[PDB]
Amino acid sequence: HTIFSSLEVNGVNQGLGEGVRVPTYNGPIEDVTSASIACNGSPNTVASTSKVITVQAGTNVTAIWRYMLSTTGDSPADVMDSSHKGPTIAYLKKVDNAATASGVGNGWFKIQQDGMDSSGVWGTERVINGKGRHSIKIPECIAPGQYLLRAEMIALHAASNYPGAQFYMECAQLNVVGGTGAKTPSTVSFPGAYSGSDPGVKISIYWPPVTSYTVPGPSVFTC
Numbered sequence: 711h712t713i714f715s716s717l718e719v720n721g722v723n724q725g726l727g728e729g730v731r732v733p734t735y736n737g738p739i740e741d742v743t744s745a746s747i748a749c750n751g752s753p754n755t756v757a758s759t760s761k762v763i764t765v766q767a768g769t770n771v772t773a774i775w776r777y778m779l780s781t782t783g784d785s786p787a788d789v790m791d792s793s794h795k796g797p798t799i800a801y802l803k804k805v806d807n808a809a810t811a812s813g814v815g816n817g818w819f820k821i822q823q824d825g826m827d828s829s830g831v832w833g834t835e836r837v838i839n840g841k842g843r844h845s846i847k848i849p850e851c852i853a854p855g856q857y858l859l860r861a862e863m864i865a866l867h868a869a870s871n872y873p874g875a876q877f878y879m880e881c882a883q884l885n886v887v888g889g890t891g892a893k894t895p896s897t898v899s900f901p902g903a904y905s906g907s908d909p910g911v912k913i914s915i916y917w918p919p920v921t922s923y924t925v926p927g928p929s930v931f932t933c
């Protein structure tokens with residue numbers, strides 16, 4: 711239970727729910743093929759926002775994860791329960807108007823992921839113990855313009871069966887400036903890119919011990 715509730719760009723937090731479509735309820739999406747998998751949604755209520763955040767291509771944004779919209783701190787208890795082990799992931803989708811585009815459907819490409827490392831430490835744990843900061847490199851080589859940024863944390867503590875995995879995601883609204891447009895990524899659909907049978911969705915993270923973890927979705931796009 712957690713919310714990607716604000717975005718930091720160039721050392722400046724852009725405001726709670728400002729440029730990020732945030733729900734008030736921090737409950738997960740559990741149907742990977744629901745239309746809500748893209749930018750969250752029913753049975754949650756997601757607020758709209760008119761702010762579109764400028765970001766220079768090639769630089770980083772940081773998704774700021776918090777337990778609730780009222781959370782003030784940045785300690786583990788302020789981010790997500792430590793039982794919620796799993797990957798962190800981020801996607802971009804080119805859209806005509808980032809303030810109004812739905813996000814459902816084709817066009818998503820992955821730009822970051824953090825699964826499980828050789829020490830058995832998970833991406834969500836690095837965010838939980840890292841002040842809720844989820845750093846994401848905006849590629850320098852993509853086309854400039856309006857994008858949706860989908861930042862995601864998947865909790866796998868109850869994922870031995872499907873449904874069970876818990877998907878927490880929100881979409882930020884970006885205006886990518888300076889993008890060279892020299893590369894166009896191959897894209898996938900949300901819903902569609904994840905399946906309830908994916909090795910990274912239906913998984914017992916306790917027995918037997920996880921030796922390697924396969925983050926769901928396509929491979930990361932890199933310039």
Ligand SMILES: *[C@@H]1O[C@H](CO)[C@@H](O[C@@H]2O[C@H](CO)[C@@H](O[C@H]3O[C@H](CO[C@H]4O[C@H](CO)[C@@H](O)[C@H](O[C@H]5O[C@H](CO)[C@@H](O)[C@H](O)[C@@H]5O)[C@@H]4O)[C@@H](O)[C@H](O[C@H]4O[C@H](CO)[C@@H](O)[C@H](O)[C@@H]4O[C@H]4O[C@H](CO)[C@@H](O)[C@H](O)[C@@H]4O)[C@@H]3O)[C@H](O)[C@H]2NC(C)=O)[C@H](O)[C@H]1NC(C)=O
Nearest residue numbers: 770821822823824825826827828829831836845846847923
């Ligand atoms: C802009 O955004 C980008 C991302 O979009 C940022 O780049 C990332 O930055 C982070 C943070 O600096 C960095 O974190 C990891 O760095 C090491 C990753 O190692 C890679 O190469 C390995 C090849 O040997 C490979 O095995 C790894 O892949 C494994 O793990 C990942 C998950 O991490 C799995 O998804 C994957 O399948 C595979 O299993 C990586 O590909 C990694 O060593 C780091 O972990 C150490 O520090 C963590 C924090 O303390 C800790 O949780 C972890 O256990 C480990 O600690 C141990 O070593 C520490 C010193 O290294 C020390 O504290 C102790 O001895 C511990 O025992 C870390 O997880 C990403 O790799 C970057 N990603 C990319 C693509 O570059 C960028 O920073 C950001 N800002 C800018 C650019 O300004």
Ligand SMILES: [Cu+2]
Nearest residue numbers: 711712794865
């Ligand atoms: Cu939870």
